[model samples]
Target: RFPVIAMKVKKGILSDYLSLNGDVDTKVKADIFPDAVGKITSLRIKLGAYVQKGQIVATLDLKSPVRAPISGYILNITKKIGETVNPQSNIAVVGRIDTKQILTYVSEKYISNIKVGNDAIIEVGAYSNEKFKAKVSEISPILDSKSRTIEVYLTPIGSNLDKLIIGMFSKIKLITKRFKDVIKISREAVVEREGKKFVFKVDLESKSVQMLPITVLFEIDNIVALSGEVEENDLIVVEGMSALSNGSLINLVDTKEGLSAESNI
Candidate 1:
């Protein structure tokens, strides 16, 4: 075997993830209308004031109390005393507070891999690569006719919520499948010859290489889980193994990049 860079084989959780783009948004909002057709005699709520459901919003010329329809903040109050009072006029708008979220439109072709309660990560420009964890909460059953996509909503489940302001453009990654505690090695270490795969197993005592065959199970992100004549903590050649056979006398080289310098010395 050729003297090559090697890494000690190990096992851990291996997962498959799908990355998608998204944007920060809110979950609560609705229009507010007056209770009766009359002039606004008095205003009870200021602009951007929080209100509770069924709370009196304002009193009209006929003393008809206009009540808020939902529990939220007063986004705007448009109907002034001088404005005409009628059934079709918009009086105000209340939106729920502290319920900010991120909404994503995923292509219908990739929607099946996404599911409710799947963990996701949100990345924003202002945060500069900082990841904020979010949980998938809602998936619209109705598909968009024009764009042929579906809407997905995710709620914040990570730190630094203040960084995720409403309307911020964001991206998300949703984990779909996972395998745990299995024999695995770097993809670079597994050499393939006409469809067969093998790895140079370093004999720690003899300081040589032994090519061992293996059957790969799952591969992702340069990591592969496999079954073969291998054991945990086996020293295997990961790089510079292009030229090697069953028994190749070789010098051991450990790189901190992949193997420690101390191992080679």
Candidate 2:
């Protein structure tokens, strides 16, 4: 006998998540170099040092100090003190960590509903349940020819911002709409017959399936949102719905994972 699973109605949000794998990328990076050939008299900066614009970097042989062009972290240094360098050779590399943002490719069809300020829930391995919050900042005008997706940029919001790094596999949830205190059932449990939807609920003591009609509102992620003849404490018959029509009885076993993989439906 197939096991029967039961569930209840509750308040929750129905959102469509864009299954996207993206990487954190900085918006601004500076390749610092000196104009004209010069020798480093004194190097005053080190790797990972935050420097501001017009900050003195090093003294040159021309009796002038090489200054930073922008405010950023010194990510790399190609030339050392007393080494000959010019505009053709990069002397140092600076990166703006604050400009970091997540880049995700979104399907072209869903672009219309996605707004610039739409809330984006981000999930990663480190903080799976934390679900870092972000918002859409920009959208590409042209869709990618090969991927058929658009480059969507999202900027993070919250206190724990530095934890995010480049090249982290992530999951994105786009908040489409929300419904409060509504009943939801497994897609398989809501059987369609005669152009109407119905769910079978087993009588608690009798262990018999009761065919009840339901009005379906929305369907998402193999779950059907409905409002009709259903109760919270109702024991729904998910597995053997098709076997019994109206006058039938089958063995009842509560395996819990009958309908959609687990008892926590």
Candidate 3:
């Protein structure tokens, strides 16, 4: 008899995705432009500073003051006091941060696999322990012939939108294919023999294991979707399969205590 670690088989959704790099950006933004050619008399505003609608942001030649057209956070400011600017000069940028989205580019080969409403997960360096959920909100109809990549937009699903910073770099995992209501198990649990796959299914009543044959459907990361003789809640040997055979008696342990215990003696 050998001790082994077994896990219960469960039916759930299995998905696969493509890794991509994205940048955080606000959905609504406006560029502040000067009205006429004049020297800046006064200006006091910084990035991420909140400004009210029609609020004076800067003064030109101590006479005309530039006012923010909208009430939102200042995203960018390119000019300072005493600096001359004209009507064509864009001095600052403002945007509503309540709504945010990720801008990413996807290769043309995978463009067909992605669509609006596809699920995705976003990760940023600032928050290492948490992952944000998002979905594809928009996809450009045309492709960039120069780069051969299509632009994709993803919007966060729910709350915690404040955690993300504008212009921050992010990693995106876009789920392109998903299979629902399928049987899945650890890829390491399946034993390959004679080009066929098998898993040792434990029989709780008899305290033995049956070498059940199974068909591997699809694999995603460390898990594999399967179509086999196994059923839900069926405990299959996940560890110590090297010394196990069909109809062999098993000692169910919380962890691996099989051959290691013997060699230590």
Candidate 4:
């Protein structure tokens, strides 16, 4: 009740795309330590507490709980009340305001792929497939001496602050360019024969068929960009192309192009 055939077609405009990965970071991160060695007298802020600049966050028996030097939230409290700590001991970690930053490491080969102000999407590993919008803020002028890699810095757009967290690893997708008018056809419809590529174009006149060689521009996913000259609404034989010769007669039956001759295969 059905047969295979090829089809003639025209190019349709499409968009260009690219993909990348990265991680989430803070613009300002400080590791608070005791100025002098002493026992921790009290901790004013708990883990994840939001504090302001000059805010008293912790006190040591050696003096008093030290105030935060900057405005931000308490991300971590390393030392507990009544715990003895020295000047070198870390008391806590404070992450400055919600201004988000991303530290992404890219291979040296991809250096050309990155540019300032490029749009990027960051997928935090902890979020399970969620993506946050960001932009390329900075790129290292120097490459890593050993790994030969570059570090890129990104800043979020401020809409998805609720989803970003400290030390969150993320995959970044950087959009380089976008195309509007491009043709995309099913890759399966294209065939390669004797080092030449072509598609089957059905001719309604005299119920004939024609093999049209196509120049492939680019392929994305399962679709391909074919370069040929044809009307937008022209019919093409997408199936059973292997069975048809250079010139064959086609019969319209059951919504299929039934060839009158047997296929060599």
Candidate 5:
């Protein structure tokens, strides 16, 4: 034989937050061109060939192989063997492979909310559902005149670069702040009575009901931040809150017990 206990539940708050849809961009992009006017003697590297820094990629008529200024893959071949080129002429397009960055564009309306060194999660269009952690490396001090948007540069944390491409579209979510070790409760547990918000708190030890008025800090998705007299792991009325009243006697039920109650009804 077991004793049935009547108890009221108090909802505790936990803080976990998230943000939705934003744009993504690369950290760096550069167009490679020759420094001097000369005729291309030979194409030492093909398109998509990985080259090292200071490595001669193409030879000029008056000079030896034109060394690469940075380590990257040859993205495009604009000049071929024996082609005439000048300093202003683009010979090839190269981009770094080992490292990458994202330049996210956010609307001007959200300018005050974003800042440098804020945490961000980026999702490249090519890699859906795959999130990459990054941080705000740079933020433009001035807003764009035409687009009315601010550009934010994000750099990855470590050297584990994967599947990132230049000019690839990406989605970014910037985290402005975080709340830890705070009280949080499910949004549904909060009830409105007489234009005031109340929650049915249960005293597990004494099996009594207490109506607690809580000040809500913020609501993020399904969870809400509440400040009131409550502790962690206090069971609150998430279901049937409308039926329960202040100081009402109720039976606290587990999932099985709730199912049996419904079955009996």
Candidate 6:
């Protein structure tokens, strides 16, 4: 028998995530084109100006005014006053940039684990270390033939929307699996034997430890979500278990100065 420090079994939520990279972009965008070949004469709006659908943006030498194709902020003005305006010329670009979203590509190997509505976290270099919450909004059903990857779009939800800049690089963690109300414990508490994994559970009535089998379901950091023949509030050895065996007598000690502080040798 040996003394060991133990923690009561608890239940909590656990998640598994897949890391991916992406870039921020507007939810919608459109390019404004000249209706006819001409030179720009009168400019009505500047870059970053908000415009309504069909609003006049610029007047050409031909007297034909370029109008916004969609209601959004002016992302850019490609043509300046007196610049050549042709049917194919891009006069300006308009985009709904008040809200931002992220675009990423996932390889076919991991695409199956991702789905629409999955929760994600977004991190941008410019935002320091702050993480923004997001959700998977769209997923392409077909994979790109050459790259064998599928496109995924995520929308920020209830986050500091102003922090995201269009075209900024993004790091994303898409949570693929989540378990709730499961037995959880410290990762170091479970001892792995030659071909089995078990933990020394403290039996309060008998004042001894009982080895119990555990099935690891998910893990994050130092915590592990588990499914086993254990119940909530059951004390399990968390420290000083190396020298412990089944039926080992344990002297319960305060966590601040637990029996683990004593030398096993």
TM-score of each: 0.70, 0.69, 0.85, 0.75, 0.69, 0.75
Could you give candidate 1's per-residue lDDT for residues 123-154 as a string of tens digits?
Answer: 87535446788889989998998999998989
In order, how many clashes per candidate? Answer: 3, 1, 0, 21, 15, 0
Worst 10 residues of 4 by lDDT: 256-265
Model 3: per-residue Cα lDDT over 38-144, one tens digit each: 99887768898999888888889649878888889998898878788998888899989887899999999998878899989888954544468899999988799
Model 1 lowest lDDT segment of ten? 256-265
lDDT agreement with native, every candidate: 0.76, 0.71, 0.81, 0.68, 0.63, 0.80
Backbone clash total for model 3 is: 0
Error of 2 at 153 (Å): 2.4
Q: List all candidate RMSDs to the true structure.
A: 6.4, 5.0, 6.3, 7.3, 7.7, 6.4
Off by over 4 Å in 2: 1-3, 26-29, 38-47, 56-66, 75-85, 88-92, 105-107, 124-131, 140-150, 166-171, 177-181, 192-197, 215-222, 239-242, 247-265
Which candidate ranks first by lDDT, i.e. highest? 3
| lDDT: the better of candidates 4 and 6 | 6
What are the per-residue Cα lDDT tens digits for candidate 2 across 1-265?
A: 3345555344344444556667666788877777667788888899879999989887777476777889998867888777887777788877788887788898888888888987777767645444678888998798888988988998878767766654456676666655545566667878888998788877667666778899877777787767888766566766667765553454666534322322111
In model 5, what lDDT does residue 14 have? 38
Tens digits of per-residue lDDT for model 4, 14-66: 33444556657688878787667788877888878887877877778737667
lDDT of each residue in 1-265, candidate 5, tens digit only: 1122322332333333234344333333355667677898877889779888777888887474676777778877787787888877777777765446676567788778676787777766444446577787888887888988877777866433465555566666677555544456567778888888877776666654677887777667666666776555555666666777777766666411111111000
Model 3 lDDT on a 0 to 1 scale: 0.81
Instruction: Identify the superior model by lDDT, candidate 2 or candidate 3.
Output: 3
For candidate 1, what is the TM-score? 0.70
What RMSD value applies to candidate 5? Answer: 7.7
Model 2: lDDT to the true structure: 0.71
The TM-score that candidate 6 achieves is: 0.75
> Which pairs in model 1 have colliding backbones?
1-248, 254-259, 255-259
